[PDB]
RNA sequence: UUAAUUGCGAUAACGAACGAGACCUUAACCUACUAAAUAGUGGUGCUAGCAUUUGCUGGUUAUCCACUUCUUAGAGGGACUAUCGGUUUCAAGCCGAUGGAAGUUUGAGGCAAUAACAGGUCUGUGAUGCCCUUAGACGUUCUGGGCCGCACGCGCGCUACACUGACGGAGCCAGCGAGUCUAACCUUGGCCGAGAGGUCUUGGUAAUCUUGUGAAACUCCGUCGUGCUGGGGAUAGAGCAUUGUAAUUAUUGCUCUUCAACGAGGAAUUCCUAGUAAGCGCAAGUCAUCAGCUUGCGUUGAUUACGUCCCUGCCCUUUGUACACAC
């Protein structure tokens, strides 16, 4: 119907919109990632998340609302859009999930040093070859300071960075 | 009835294995066809300045998107095309079927 | 507002643009003995213009005195047949 | 390879259109050097007059100069498509007119003066001596004072 | 810059130490032996290793 | 079938595909005899393989070269390289390899680039300048 | 067509004769930039000969009725023969003088 | 009143706005993605616009 | 033997064919010639006032004879060029569509060409035969 | 020695990490492996022409075949200094002869360590610490303007200062790239015309169409010939219409005109080792309209260089120091 280039660009922008929505609200529900399954007359979207039992809602109401939002937005018949929720092993393999975890920890009021150290220790138990956490901004100070913690080896350049790392 | 199945994805390995298994299915189910016609990789180049503001050296970067396109013509029965649509479906590849 | 130049005048040469009989016969009697024939040499030796030089060359080659070797545009090389 | 001998009927100076003009050069460009007339116009009027282009303005006959000036001062006499004129649909008449050496400056004076007397923006710009085509005057074009 | 990196250095030393009999001076055979006795994730890196092994064997053939 | 050999000549962007086989002994380019490109110098430049090998030994062998891509110089260079390569292929597939080896030796002695394409490929232009290695300028005040 | 002898011979003779056989290089030293005379390689001899040749040709062809082709031909004829007026040799002898004197 | 928005916005950057930060200036319209340049820089990593050269 | 147009030297053949065409002189010339500059990007009229029309007609006939089907736009793109747009740089400018179309119509009337499917013109059989016959006549009367 | 704490090696160091290198895309070889009515190579009826005599061009799309040698995807293979000659505790390396594709990593890029600038950025945002409007507000909008204003100085730039020309007629070239679904883009066509202009669908969700992008300089024949002149195109005016309901402080495109400084430019400074400096252009970006700009690509395509620390910079070591926001 319309051009394939614009079609897949809209695919990308819709992916960005849904990722922004998920990371904006489902973050405190342990949201980690999404992948869109395209099927004739069906849009399956998968979600591997950490706090699945509390993102689910009592008898699938929140999942129903997430579904029916985009359903009514693109005049889908109910059931055509479907989102599935699973839990992945080794939750430390989710940079976004760890990001939102210590993000909430800051608004809770934990110490930055201890909190970041706990995050990096959780990751080291998860089994990362290298972990690196930088916190930048005001640290009981009126001048912006940037500080970092690291363990293991952390490659900084190359397609090994483009693929193997998580940021 | 004189349909065309085309694949316009950007996942190169998923496209490759999709084409491979579709070819294997067609050959093993004895449907005469010509090989998957392969189109030139369409590259989309979008050039953008790094700096949000107007400062810094006049540095540039070019974001690139790649598109691989394949198509195959099938003259195959209604029940068998229903079977092909409903099975051997592999995600990650945007595959669409038209007629003529 | 300032001219900002020297603009000294030229030599005001006597290059001949129109051709009369006293120049026709003059160039006819002066073109012999000249090993190399060209528009530039005609201009520099007869003080004649480009139009007159080309017109005279084509008239002479029509009459038949010297057989040319190349008629390439922007560069005409001629020699006398002796 | 035509050759025509010029007799004593040639004049070292020729006075046409109330201005001195130099002969000895091509007819078309002897017309171009006239004020208000240029390359294309001179060429097309020579074509209408049916004069040999290779010929120079010096070696022309009396009826040839007369037909040249006739086509210059009245194209409608020689069946010209009538839109070739230089100043058409003017203010004074509103129809197609033709301009010559004095005429260009006379009519320029007239219509610029109309602009000044109506105090139009273009006219006031011409009075000030500034750019009237909306050009950029901040940096470029300082050599006019 | 025909020098080789330290990873090529150590790969050559180690794999020659316990793979001397299987490879020889022949370049193509060295390539086709190292590729199969090694798990190299780069064709260019494999070519580097094979070239250094041939250089080492040329060194060994005398002295 | 007819014994016919298909080769090509290449330059910057000019591809010239040459078909050589048993014919009446004529060389035609883009449907035209090779005499009528009319650069008056590139004519002899594309004559060079023919003037070097001699046309006598190919009395009933004809070549049809069709050219595309690139400018005039690149096109005539692809023409000469193709009319050489097809000739060598014919001398290998249908005439003695004894003659083929010496013919390609003569081609190499005349010029290496007639059989081996120029490795001078286009160089991409980088941002920050009008040219591949040319930067815009550099002002101080 | 003029001087019907071998055209390649006369142009190679012009190149050989016009080749600057000795010139000089700038040397800083200290306090003042001075000049010191050296002899030059045949590569640079022939390159400078043809460079001066074509520079004089372009100068003599710039803004005149004379075409670049025949101005270059007459420049080669003068460079092969030697008439103290050609651009190429008139700068060759000038550079030789400013090298010998600087020496 | 019905003349609150009389002046048209059918062309120019009055119409073109970014789909992320509602930008009007710097809107790259190409391919119909309608986002500003810095938003494109930020979201290329996640959308799938990858830098190779 | 059979001699095709792509075998003969372009310039002298075209000139001889134009001279023969001019001597033939039964083409019903329009007359508005000697007014146009043959392009919108040109700045100066052509030189040969009394002619150049048989030149243009023979050129377009030869071009359409070698090609398969080209239109007025293709002819304008091919015959056009760049215009010196003042201090602005040069860009391609198309040739004169009115004269291109009118020579298209004149060649239609003399029957060398005909309308074609897909838009454009093809070469009529009589056009082929007469153009190539006059090519042979030029080859037989040039010496 | 290399471009490199690249390595060889020596050795109060041994063992590790990052950067570098590796890494990935682009261009360059295969006449070989799987595939191209979105095209041809090779054979026939429709074939027409040159023409009669034995060859070239194309169309004829359920009109009959093998393939990709020309538009292409892939375990693809291959330059690892491969072989050899010279110098080096002859170790790492460097200079030379070549089929082979290049033997400066075969090129050109992306990413790029640790620390820092108070370098840009609140003008990218329902992001903020601290001050400002809280109701004749700085909150959203309407009509005009303005950022284009010009005595002047500067900064990438385009055309130039003519004969390798200017102009005129004829012969041909590819590539990066874009293009209309609830809106109307790229425009293939008949036509009325000096040109710019004015119609209904046939073409297109795009190897099929726009687009052999028939582009520009470029090849052949022609006018002018050294006059600030047919060079240079700008400052004036007269007209013709798609843009915008709105050009006007010419928006723009064509025709006439105008014929202005400019005759290669002082001190002073930018890019450059191969298809690259440069000259020509083309596609996209911002596009209702407007490129002289930018991002890339393509055509024509050079002598220059294989060295240096002399000027300007970088790193390391040694060294002096009364410096330490650090000459």
Swiss-Prot record, chain A:
Keywords: Cytoplasm, Isopeptide bond, Methylation, Phosphoprotein, Ribonucleoprotein, Ribosomal protein, RNA-binding, Ubl conjugation. The modification Phosphothreonine is found at residues 41, 67. It is found in: Cytoplasm. One of its GO terms (molecular function) is DNA-(apurinic or apyrimidinic site) endonuclease activity. Residues 18-89 form the KH type-2 domain. One of its GO terms (biological process) is maintenance of translational fidelity. The keyword RNA-binding applies. The keyword Cytoplasm applies. The modification Phosphoserine is found at residues 94, 126. There is a cross-link at residues 103, 129, 138, 148 (Glycyl lysine isopeptide (Lys-Gly) (interchain with G-Cter in ubiquitin)). The modification Omega-N-methylarginine is found at residue 143. Present with 146000 molecules/cell in log phase SD medium. Component of the small ribosomal subunit (SSU). Mature yeast ribosomes consist of a small (40S) and a large (60S) subunit. The 40S small subunit contains 1 molecule of ribosomal RNA (18S rRNA) and 33 different proteins (encoded by 57 genes). The large 60S subunit contains 3 rRNA molecules (25S, 5.8S and 5S rRNA) and 46 different proteins (encoded by 81 genes). Belongs to the universal ribosomal protein uS3 family. This is Small ribosomal subunit protein uS3. It comes from Saccharomyces cerevisiae (strain ATCC 204508 / S288c). The lineage of its organism: Eukaryota, Fungi, Dikarya, Ascomycota, Saccharomycotina.
Curated annotation (Swiss-Prot), chain C:
GO terms for biological process: cytoplasmic translation. GO terms for cellular component: cytosol; cytosolic small ribosomal subunit. Keywords: Cytoplasm, Methylation, Ribonucleoprotein, Ribosomal protein. The keyword Cytoplasm applies. It comes from the Eukaryota. GO terms for molecular function: structural constituent of ribosome. It is found in: Cytoplasm. The keyword Isomerase does not apply. Residues 1-7 have a biased composition (Basic residues). Component of the ribosome, a large ribonucleoprotein complex responsible for the synthesis of proteins in the cell. The small ribosomal subunit (SSU) binds messenger RNAs (mRNAs) and translates the encoded message by selecting cognate aminoacyl-transfer RNA (tRNA) molecules. The large subunit (LSU) contains the ribosomal catalytic site termed the peptidyl transferase center (PTC), which catalyzes the formation of peptide bonds, thereby polymerizing the amino acids delivered by tRNAs into a polypeptide chain. It is presumed that the precursor part of S25 is engaged in assembling of the small subunit, thus being essential in ribosome maturation. Present with 322000 molecules/cell in log phase SD medium. This is Small ribosomal subunit protein eS25A. The gene is RPS25A.
Swiss-Prot record, chain G:
There is a cross-link at residue 81 (Glycyl lysine isopeptide (Lys-Gly) (interchain with G-Cter in ubiquitin)). It is found in: Cytoplasm. N-terminally acetylated by acetyltransferase NatA. Component of the ribosome, a large ribonucleoprotein complex responsible for the synthesis of proteins in the cell. The small ribosomal subunit (SSU) binds messenger RNAs (mRNAs) and translates the encoded message by selecting cognate aminoacyl-transfer RNA (tRNA) molecules. The large subunit (LSU) contains the ribosomal catalytic site termed the peptidyl transferase center (PTC), which catalyzes the formation of peptide bonds, thereby polymerizing the amino acids delivered by tRNAs into a polypeptide chain. Belongs to the universal ribosomal protein uS7 family. Component of the small ribosomal subunit (SSU). Mature yeast ribosomes consist of a small (40S) and a large (60S) subunit. The 40S small subunit contains 1 molecule of ribosomal RNA (18S rRNA) and 33 different proteins (encoded by 57 genes). The large 60S subunit contains 3 rRNA molecules (25S, 5.8S and 5S rRNA) and 46 different proteins (encoded by 81 genes). This is Small ribosomal subunit protein uS7. It comes from Saccharomyces cerevisiae (strain ATCC 204508 / S288c). The lineage of its organism: Eukaryota, Fungi, Dikarya, Ascomycota, Saccharomycotina.
UniProtKB/Swiss-Prot annotation, chain H:
Disulfide bonds: none annotated. Coiled coil: none annotated. Transmembrane segments: none annotated. It is found in: Cytoplasm. Binds 1 zinc ion per subunit. Its main location: cytoplasm. Component of the small ribosomal subunit (SSU). Mature yeast ribosomes consist of a small (40S) and a large (60S) subunit. The 40S small subunit contains 1 molecule of ribosomal RNA (18S rRNA) and 33 different proteins (encoded by 57 genes). The large 60S subunit contains 3 rRNA molecules (25S, 5.8S and 5S rRNA) and 46 different proteins (encoded by 81 genes). Present with 6490 molecules/cell in log phase SD medium. There are 2 genes for uS14 in yeast. The keyword Membrane does not apply. Keywords: Cytoplasm, Metal-binding, Phosphoprotein, Ribonucleoprotein, Ribosomal protein, Zinc. The keyword Amino-acid biosynthesis does not apply. One of its GO terms (cellular component) is cytosolic small ribosomal subunit. It comes from the Eukaryota. Its cofactor is Zn(2+). One of its GO terms (molecular function) is zinc ion binding. Component of the ribosome, a large ribonucleoprotein complex responsible for the synthesis of proteins in the cell. The small ribosomal subunit (SSU) binds messenger RNAs (mRNAs) and translates the encoded message by selecting cognate aminoacyl-transfer RNA (tRNA) molecules. The large subunit (LSU) contains the ribosomal catalytic site termed the peptidyl transferase center (PTC), which catalyzes the formation of peptide bonds, thereby polymerizing the amino acids delivered by tRNAs into a polypeptide chain. One of its GO terms (biological process) is cytoplasmic translation. This is Small ribosomal subunit protein uS14A.
């Amino acid at each position: 119907l319309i051009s394939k280039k614009r079609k897949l660009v809209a695919d990308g922008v819709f992916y960005a919109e849904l990722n922004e929505f998920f990371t904006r609200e489902l973050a405190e529900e342990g949201y980690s990632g999404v992948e869109v399954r395209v099927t004739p007359t069906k849009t399956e979207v998968i979600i591997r998340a950490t706090r699945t039992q509390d993102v689910l809602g009592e008898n699938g109401r929140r999942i129903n609302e997430l579904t029916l939002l985009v359903q009514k937005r693109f005049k889908y018949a109910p059931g055509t859009i479907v989102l599935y929720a699973e839990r992945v092993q080794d939750r430390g393999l989710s940079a976004v999930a760890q990001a939102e975890s210590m993000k909430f920890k800051l608004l809770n009021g934990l110490a930055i040093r201890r909190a970041a150290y706990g995050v990096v220790r959780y990751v080291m138990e998860s089994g990362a070859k290298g972990c690196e956490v930088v916190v930048s901004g005001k640290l009981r100070a009126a001048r912006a300071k940037a500080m970092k913690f690291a363990d293991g080896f952390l490659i900084h350049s190359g397609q090994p960075v483009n693929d193997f790392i998580d940021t | 009835i004189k349909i065309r199945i085309t694949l316009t994805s950007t996942k190169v390995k998923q496209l490759e294995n999709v084409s491979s298994n579709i070819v294997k299915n067609a050959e093993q189910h004895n449907l005469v066809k010509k090989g998957p016609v392969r189109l030139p990789t369409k590259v989309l180049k979008i050039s953008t300045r790094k700096t949000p503001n107007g400062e810094g050296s006049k540095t540039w970067e070019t974001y690139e998107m790649r598109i691989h396109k394949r198509y195959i013509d099938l003259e195959a029965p209604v029940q068998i095309v229903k079977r092909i649509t409903q099975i051997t479906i592999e995600p990650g590849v945007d595959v669409e079927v038209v007629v003529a | 507002k300032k001219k900002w130049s020297k603009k000294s005048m030229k030599d005001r040469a006597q290059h001949a643009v129109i051709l009369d009989q006293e120049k026709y016969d003059r160039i006819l009697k002066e073109v012999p003995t000249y090993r190399y024939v060209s528009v530039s040499v005609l201009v520099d030796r007869l003080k004649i213009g480009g139009s007159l030089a080309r017109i005279a060359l084509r008239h002479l080659e029509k009459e038949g005195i010297i057989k040319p070797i190349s008629k390439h545009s922007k560069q005409a090389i001629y020699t006398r047949a002796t | 390879s035509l050759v025509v001998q010029e007799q004593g009927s040639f004049q070292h100076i020729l006075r046409l259109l109330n201005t001195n003009v130099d002969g000895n050069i091509k007819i078309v460009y002897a017309l171009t050097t006239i004020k208000g007339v240029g390359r294309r116009y001179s060429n097309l009027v020579c074509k209408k007059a049916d004069v040999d282009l290779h010929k120079r303005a010096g070696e022309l006959t009396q009826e040839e100069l007369e037909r040249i000036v006739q086509i210059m001062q009245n194209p409608t006499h020689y069946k010209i498509p009538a839109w070739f004129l230089n100043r058409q649909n003017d203010i004074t008449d509103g129809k197609d007119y033709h301009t010559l050496a004095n005429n260009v400056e006379s009519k320029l004076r007239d219509d610029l003066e109309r602009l000044k007397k109506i105090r139009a923006h273009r006219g006031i710009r011409h009075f000030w001596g500034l750019r009237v085509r909306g050009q950029h005057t901040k940096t470029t074009g300082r050599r006019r004072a | 810059g025909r020098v080789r990196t330290k990873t090529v250095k150590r790969a050559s030393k180690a794999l020659i130490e316990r793979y001397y009999p299987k490879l020889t001076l022949d370049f193509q055979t060295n390539k086709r032996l190292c590729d199969e006795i090694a798990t190299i994730q780069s064709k260019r890196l494999r070519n580097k290793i094979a070239g250094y092994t041939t250089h080492l064997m040329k060194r060994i053939q005398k002295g | 079938a007819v014994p016919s050999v298909q080769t090509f000549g290449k330059k910057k962007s000019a591809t010239a595909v040459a078909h050589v086989k048993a014919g009446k002994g004529l060389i035609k380019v883009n449907g035209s005899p090779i005499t009528l490109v009319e650069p008056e110098i590139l004519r002899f430049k594309v004559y060079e393989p023919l003037l070097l090998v001699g046309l006598d030994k190919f009395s009933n062998i004809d070549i049809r070269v069709r050219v595309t891509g690139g400018g005039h110089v690149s096109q005539v260079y692809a023409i000469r390289q193709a009319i050489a390569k097809g000739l060598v292929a014919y001398h290998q597939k249908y005439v003695d390899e004894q003659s083929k080896n010496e013919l390609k030796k003569a081609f190499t002695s005349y010029d290496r680039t007639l059989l081996i394409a120029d490795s001078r490929r286009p160089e991409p232009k980088k941002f920050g300048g009008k040219g591949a290695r040319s930067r815009f300028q550099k002002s101080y005040r | 067509v003029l001087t019907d002898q071998n055209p390649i011979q006369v142009v190679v003779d012009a190149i050989t004769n016009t080749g600057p056989r000795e010139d000089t290089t700038r040397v800083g030293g200290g306090g003042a930039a001075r000049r010191q005379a050296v002899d030059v390689s045949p590569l640079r001899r022939v390159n400078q000969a043809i460079a001066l040749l074509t520079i004089g040709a372009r100068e003599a062809a710039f803004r005149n009725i004379k075409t670049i082709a025949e101005t270059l031909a007459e420049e080669l004829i003068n460079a092969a023969k030697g008439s103290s007026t050609s651009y190429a040799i008139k700068k060759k002898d000038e550079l030789e003088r400013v090298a010998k004197s600087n020496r | 009143e019905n003349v609150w928005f009389s002046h048209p916005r059918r062309y120019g950057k009055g119409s073109r706005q970014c789909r992320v930060c509602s930008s009007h200036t710097g809107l790259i319209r190409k391919y119909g993605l309608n986002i500003c340049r810095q938003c494109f820089r930020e979201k290329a990593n996640d959308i799938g616009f990858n830098k190779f050269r | 033997p059979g001699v095709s147009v792509r075998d003969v030297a372009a310039q002298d053949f075209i000139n001889a064919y134009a001279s023969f065409l001019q001597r033939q002189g039964k083409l019903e010339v329009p007359g508005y010639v000697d007014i146009v500059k043959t392009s919108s990007g040109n700045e100066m009229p052509p030189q040969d006032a009394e002619g150049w029309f048989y030149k243009r007609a023979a050129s377009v006939a030869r071009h359409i004879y070698m090609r398969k089907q080209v239109g007025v736009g293709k002819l304008n793109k091919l015959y056009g060029g760049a215009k010196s747009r003042g201090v602005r740089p040069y860009k391609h400018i198309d040739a004169s569509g009115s004269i291109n179309r009118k020579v298209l119509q004149a060649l239609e009337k003399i029957g060398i060409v005909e309308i074609s499917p897909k838009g454009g013109r093809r070469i009529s059989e009589n056009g082929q035969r007469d153009l190539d016959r006059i090519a042979a006549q030029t080859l037989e009367e040039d010496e």
